[PDB]
Design a binder for this molecule. Structure first.
Ligand SMILES: [Cl-]
Ligand code: NI
Lengths: 201, 201, 201
C-alpha cells in the first residue's frame, strides 16, 4: 500500500508536467491560426456589405489598380470589365476621326477641296478644273444673276477673258462718236447740193 | 501515510482547476477565430473556380459596382482595368467630333463656309471674298466653259458687271444701222458725182 | 481507506481521459479553422501588398475576366469600373462618325453638296441653283477679278451667256473698218468741193 500511494504521486507528477506542456501548445496553436486569419483578412478584397452590390477598393486617396484583366467581350449589354488596351483601341480611332475632321476643315477653308479651288491667297481661283463639261450656270430661283466684281479682260483675237460694262460703255461711245461724224457728213452732203444748184459762171 | 492522502487531494484540486481554465481558454479562442473567418468568408470577393480565370461578382442580376479604381494605363495591349473618368474623356471627344460633323454638313448646305458663300436665301453669292488673287478660271478638262445664266450688267464707266449676249447683240444691231447709213451716203455721193459731170447752167 | 484509494485511482484515470479529450478537442478545432482558411486563401481575390495599391489578378499569363459589373458612373473624375456594354455604346458612335467623315469627303470630291455642284463628270457646273438672289460677285481683297476660261457665248436678243474678249475684238475690228470708210468718204467729199471750185465750162 506504500506502493499504491507512491504510484499515485508519480501519476500526478506526470499529469502536472503534461498540463504545462499542453498549455504552451495551445497558446501557440491559437496564436498561429490568429496570425494567419489576420493576414488573410488584411489582404482579402471585400464586398462593402451583405448585398454585395458594391466593392469600394482599399487603396485610399490614390485608389487601387486592377491589372491582369482579360479583355472583356465588347458587345451590347456586356457585363465584363474592359481594360486599358481595349480603351486604347478606341482612343486611336477617335483620334483619327478628330484628325480627319480637322483636316477637312483646314482643307475647305484654304480651298484645296471641292470644284472651286485656290492654291494660296494670291492664286487663280479655279472652278471645276479636274472635271469636264462645256457650261457654268449662275442662275438661281429668283432668276438670272448679275456677275459683278469683274475686272475687265484682255480684248484680243484669242482672249477667253469675259468683258464688263465699262468695256461696253467704251464701245458705245465710239458708236455715238461715229453717228455724230456721219451726221456731219450728211450735212456736208446737203451743202454740196445747194452749191451745185446756186453757183454761176 | 495518513497525510499523503490529504496532499494528493489538494494536488487534484489544482489539477482540476487548470483543466477548467484550459477548457475555457479554448472555447473563447476558437469561437473568436471562427467568427472572424465566417465574416471573412461571406464578405470576400472570390474566383469562380481554381483556374482563377474568372470573377463573377456576387451582386445578383443587378450586378456589382467596383469603385475607387485607379486610372489604368491606357496603352496598347494594357491589362489594367479602366474607370468611368477615362471613358468620360473619350465620350466628350466623340461628342466633339459628332457635333463637328453635323455642323460641317449644315453649313456646306447653308453656304456659310468655304470659298463660295451666300449668307441667306436672297443674299448675294460671293466667290473667294476673303482672299486675294486677280483671276477666276472656269476651264475644265473639256477646255473653256461657256458661262451662262448671266443677267444683263450695267453699262457705264465704272461698271464691273459682266456683259451678256442680249447686250452684245444690241451693239451689233447698232453697227448694222451705221453700215446702212454709210450705204445711203455712198450712193448719194455717186449720184452727186453724176450731177456735177452733167450740169451746165 | 482502501475504498478511498480506488476512489482516487479512479479520479486520476478520469483526469487522464480528460487531458486526452482535450488533446483531441484542440487538434480537431484547429484543423477545422485551417481547412476553412486554406480554402479562403485559395479562392479569395487578393491585394498585392499592404498599401492595397494594386490587385494583380491570379488568372496567370492569359488573365482573369471580371463579370457581372454594373454600369459605372460616366463623369469626370469617376473611379467606377466600366463594362463592355459601355465601351460598345461609345464604339457605335465612333463607327458612325467614321463613316460620316468618309461620306462627306467623297461628296465634296464629287460636286454634290453646297452651292457649286455638278451631277456628272461631263455636266453643267451649277452655282447656287436651289437658293436665290441676283448677284454673283468675284471680288477678293486684291480688288476685282478677270473671269477667264470663258468660251464664246451666244449672241442674240435673248441670250444670257457671258461674252469673252475675243468677241469684243470682232466689235472693235468692224469699228475700225467703219472708220476707214469714213476717212475715204471724207476725202471724197473734199475732192468734190475742190472740184466745184475749179471747173470752167
Ligand atoms: Cl469619333
Ligand atoms: Ni458749173
Amino acid at each position: 500500500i506504500e506502493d499504491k500511494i507512491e504510484e499515485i504521486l508519480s501519476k500526478i507528477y506526470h499529469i502536472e508536467n503534461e498540463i504545462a506542456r499542453i498549455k504552451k501548445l495551445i497558446d501557440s496553436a491559437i496564436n498561429n491560426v490568429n496570425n494567419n486569419v489576420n493576414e488573410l483578412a488584411n489582404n482579402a478584397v471585400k464586398y462593402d456589405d451583405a448585398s454585395k452590390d458594391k466593392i469600394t477598393l482599399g487603396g485610399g486617396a490614390t485608389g487601387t489598380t486592377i491589372t491582369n484583366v482579360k479583355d472583356g467581350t465588347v458587345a451590347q449589354g456586356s457585363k465584363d470589365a474592359v481594360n486599358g488596351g481595349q480603351l486604347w483601341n478606341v482612343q486611336q480611332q477617335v483620334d483619327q476621326n478628330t484628325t480627319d475632321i480637322s483636316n477637312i476643315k483646314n482643307d475647305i477653308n484654304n480651298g484645296t477641296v471641292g470644284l472651286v479651288q485656290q492654291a494660296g491667297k494670291d492664286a487663280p481661283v479655279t472652278v471645276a478644273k479636274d472635271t469636264g463639261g462645256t457650261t457654268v450656270n449662275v442662275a438661281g430661283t429668283d432668276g438670272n444673276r448679275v456677275v459683278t466684281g469683274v475686272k475687265e479682260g484682255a480684248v484680243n483675237a484669242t482672249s477667253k477673258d469675259a468683258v464688263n460694262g465699262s468695256q461696253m460703255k467704251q464701245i458705245e461711245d465710239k458708236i455715238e462718236e461715229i453717228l455724230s461724224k456721219i451726221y456731219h457728213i450728211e450735212n456736208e452732203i446737203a451743202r454740196i447740193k445747194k452749191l451745185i444748184k446756186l453757183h454761176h459762171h
